[PDB]
Amino acid sequence: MKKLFLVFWWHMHQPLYREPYTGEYLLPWTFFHAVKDYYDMPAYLKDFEIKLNFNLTPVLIDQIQEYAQGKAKDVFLEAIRKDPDDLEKEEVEKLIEFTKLNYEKPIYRFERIRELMNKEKLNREELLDLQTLNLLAWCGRTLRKDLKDLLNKGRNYTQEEKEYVLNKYFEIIKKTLSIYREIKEEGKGSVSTSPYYHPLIPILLNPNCVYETTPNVKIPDFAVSFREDASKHVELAKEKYFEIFGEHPVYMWPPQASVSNEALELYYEKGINMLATDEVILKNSVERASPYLRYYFRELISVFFRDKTLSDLIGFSYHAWNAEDAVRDFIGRLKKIHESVDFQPVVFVVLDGENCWEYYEENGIPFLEKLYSTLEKEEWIETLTLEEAMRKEDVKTEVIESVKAGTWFDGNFLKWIGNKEKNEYWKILIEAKKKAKNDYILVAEGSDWFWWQGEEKAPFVEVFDKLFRSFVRRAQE
Ligand SMILES: OC[C@H]1O[C@H](O[C@H]2[C@H](O)[C@@H](O)[C@@H](O[C@H]3[C@H](O)[C@@H](O)[C@@H](O[C@H]4[C@H](O)[C@@H](O)[C@@H](O[C@H]5[C@H](O)[C@@H](O)[C@@H](O)O[C@@H]5CO)O[C@@H]4CO)O[C@@H]3CO)O[C@@H]2CO)[C@H](O)[C@@H](O)[C@@H]1O
Known about the structure:
Blueprint lengths: L3 E9 L11 E2 L3 H10 L1 H4 L9 E4 L1 H11 L4 E2 H7 L7 H13 L9 H8 L5 H14 L3 H6 L1 H6 L5 H16 L1 H10 L5 E3 L7 H5 L21 H19 L15 H9 L4 E4 L1 H7 L8 E4 L3 E5 L2 H10 L5 H18 L5 E7 L12 H13 L3 E3 L2 H6 L5 E4 L19 H14 L6 H5 L2 H5 L9 H15 L2
Parallel strand pairs: 1-3, 1-9, 1-10, 2-4, 3-5, 6-8, 7-11
Antiparallel strand pairs: 7-8
């Protein structure tokens, strides 16, 4: 039987939201995505006989452990936790703006939220509901079955009921990293990591990588070298992986799929057997390649290229469709790949594993449950782990010699460098690295800080600029 080999690689990352001096988490994005996706995505493998693979960044690992140890001083979560009678006006405005940002996401479709937002003034019992419903909107698949009745109530929540939800939420956080260990040991999937603080390795190694796809951009004069710090990102991530899993990582996802001939060399010298990047880089780098093949880079390392179409469909398109339609579309495009090639194709599906689900109905649980059940019965599709895909001899392999540096965002680095605003953050980093006396410089080399800068008016970009400038300052002391 000619088979199609499907590889799912779910990338999970949250930049360090913890302000260095105050030790306060200024955004609750780690807590809400952990209680909703970080435990629940692998928990699918307990109920579906398929293979899924996950990528965890070290900085995400650090935050979840702090939240699981009760040490994270989340300011927003404290506004949820407290009785509304102890709530200052600023915290109440913070709660209402958080609800306004998510008001139109399907996971916030609670009738009570319609009322309370249309309400001009709010009493304590209404504020308790704005807190509790805000927590309950971010409920993952596991606890959605457990707290079904609280979720069915929809209103008239109490302080004790909200605190019960919160303890149940923290139990999931305490169980999160064990499930990644469990699915790795059980063979139900492979776990990978990225360089520690999600940096852009091609830029740190040689900033001239931006001109390979964007020749007339203006980048800041890099008067300092970041090549040593680039190795530290890879090297420290292997130790965090060894801490959690007891072995060194052999598979790594380059942050934002960023690859260069130099990064690939570095990943080879630090022991990475395989990495993955986007189809755009393949089309820029090699003449008429297919993304359905294992690739050897100069015999040193193995590179797989993701399917941009299928991955973006889940990441951006399928949320609008009914669940049955999206799954049928997905299998339809897989059936066309099967007939497009005269070999047994490998189809790599890589995307962020947490951010798309909030825009889906019921946090995407129906779509995922129909996709995993469909994939269970379709026998021309075999889901694989990254390790199984590495050892499989039914996957055609070709050797390539070069790549053109880029990312999965248009094949260029323009989302992080190129304009005056983005270049401001690099000039700050370069000048600070000249004076950097601690490793908080590595936090400031994270990709997220540069992403939010100057693109458009966006949510809580203030908070990102505060942390960047805080990490930079603490890096020079
Ligand atoms: O810009 C218009 C555009 O986006 C709109 O969505 C906005 C959301 O409605 C809003 O919530 C806003 O706020 C958050 C986001 O919700 C939250 O998740 C926050 O946290 C993380 C991600 O969770 C995390 O995964 C990480 O993501 C990385 C990703 O892992 C990596 O693979 C790569 O893709 O880069 C991502 C960023 O580096 O980091 C972010 C933070 O860095 O992110 C936001 C900041 O608070 O998010 C959207 C901003 O507008 C609407 O969808 C629509 O108007 C448009 O499509």
